[PDB]
DNA sequence: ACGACCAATTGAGCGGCCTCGGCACCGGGATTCTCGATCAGCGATGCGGAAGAGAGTGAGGACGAACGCGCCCCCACCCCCTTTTATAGCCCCCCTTC
């Protein structure tokens, strides 16, 4: 068995020890960065402050609807737009990731950038990746879970 | 001189049974509302079953081809033009007679 992320939220990961066997190896990612085999990634967490009228509803609504409201707010939106503009003018390739399609669409449309999600046909899907990779005028793509679940993204 | 004691008086306060049942506390009662599982959700995968896009070929189109006939040309070559004379009948135009 091979995998990049030998972790799952269920208590079934331990079954791999009898379904396949013990961990034959597990790379030290920091060592690989020190050796240059892996890119040095300066991870960060942007604490976007929620907007007051959003928090008012967010705190009021306790149902699953709050996932959308915490996902869509001016500050998070402005922060992404700012980081994108900055890195785009910095000539950096940027990949945007999201789960909820509603937020993904409303963000990508307002940012006039091409998104990618499940029902997007393989031809349309790959055509966007080729443009992003090669066309200098495009430098970011908005991908749903399709990008992280299983894919070969540039 | 008065202060306590004694007596007769008495009835409010007290010690108690009575009883009880409103309320609260206490504990123990089938419970209106808890939690702990099932099923539902969002967005993804894949499989399995469904449609449309390209094909064929009926066929008739346009028209390239292949032939003969056709008109027409450029081409050898051949004959006629012109001259002379003998010779004659034959012929027409003209003159001439009636």
């Amino acid at each position: 068995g091979l995998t990049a992320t030998l972790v799952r939220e269920d208590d079934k990961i331990v079954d791999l020890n009898f379904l396949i066997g013990p961990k034959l190896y597990e790379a030290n990612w920091m060592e690989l960065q020190n050796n240059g085999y892996i890119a040095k990634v300066q991870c960060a967490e942007v604490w976007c402050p929620m907007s007051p009228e959003f928090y008012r509803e967010y705190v009021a609504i306790k149902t699953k609807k709050r996932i959308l409201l915490y996902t869509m707010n001016p500050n998070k939106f402005r922060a992404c737009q700012f980081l994108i503009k900055f890195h785009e003018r910095r000539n950096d390739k940027i990949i945007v990731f999201a789960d909820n399609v509603f937020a993904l669409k409303e963000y990508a449309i307002r940012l006039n950038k091409p998104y990618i999600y499940g029902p997007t046909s393989q031809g349309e899907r790959m055509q966007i990746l080729q443009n992003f990779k090669h066309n200098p005028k495009i430098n970011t793509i908005f991908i749903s879970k399709v990008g992280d679940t299983s894919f070969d993204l540039p």
Side-chain angles (χ1 to χ4, degrees):
Chain A
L2 298 98
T3 177
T5 67
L6 209 173
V7 287
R8 205 168 72 179
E9 302 319 317
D10 62 348
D11 304 329
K12 288 188 176 72
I13 284 298
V14 292
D15 296 2
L16 292 166
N17 299 295
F18 68 78
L19 292 172
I20 301 179
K23 296 183 182 181
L24 301 170
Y25 182 75
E26 180 163 19
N28 171 342
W29 297 6
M30 315 313 292
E31 172 175 2
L32 298 184
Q33 289 179 340
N34 297 323
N35 299 342
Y37 305 132
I38 288 182
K40 175 72 73 76
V41 194
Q42 187 60 231
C43 305
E45 184 171 15
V46 180
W47 281 37
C48 305
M50 174 166 277
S51 282
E53 63 272 40
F54 287 67
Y55 208 96
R56 189 181 182 90
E57 259 51 53
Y58 169 87
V59 73
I61 73 188
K62 286 206 174 185
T63 68
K64 65 182 172 80
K65 185 66 63 61
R66 54 169 58 175
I67 78 188
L68 191 173
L69 193 60
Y70 77 60
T71 295
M72 300 187 69
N73 81 46
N75 315 84
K76 175 180 279 184
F77 187 112
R78 287 167 69 90
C80 88
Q81 186 188 11
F82 179 84
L83 276 169
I84 289 160
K85 270 185 159 194
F86 176 80
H87 281 294
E88 286 206 322
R89 74 182 61 155
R90 196 172 175 280
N91 304 313
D92 293 319
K93 294 294 180 184
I94 296 147
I95 296 175
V96 178
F97 262 103
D99 186 349
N100 297 100
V101 74
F102 181 100
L104 178 65
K105 291 204 301 175
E106 301 213 355
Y107 272 58
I109 70 189
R110 288 179 172 277
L111 272 60
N112 67 48
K113 255 65 172 186
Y115 60 86
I116 295 178
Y117 78 127
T120 300
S121 69
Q122 186 280 348
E124 192 82 26
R125 187 183 299 206
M126 299 310 174
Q127 180 179 12
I128 295 152
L129 303 186
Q130 300 302 334
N131 297 353
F132 166 80
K133 171 174 277 190
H134 302 99
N135 177 357
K137 293 178 289 185
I138 174 166
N139 284 317
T140 193
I141 50 182
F142 283 62
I143 325 182
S144 181
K145 290 189 289 237
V146 58
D148 49 79
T149 43
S150 186
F151 222 86
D152 182 11
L153 292 172

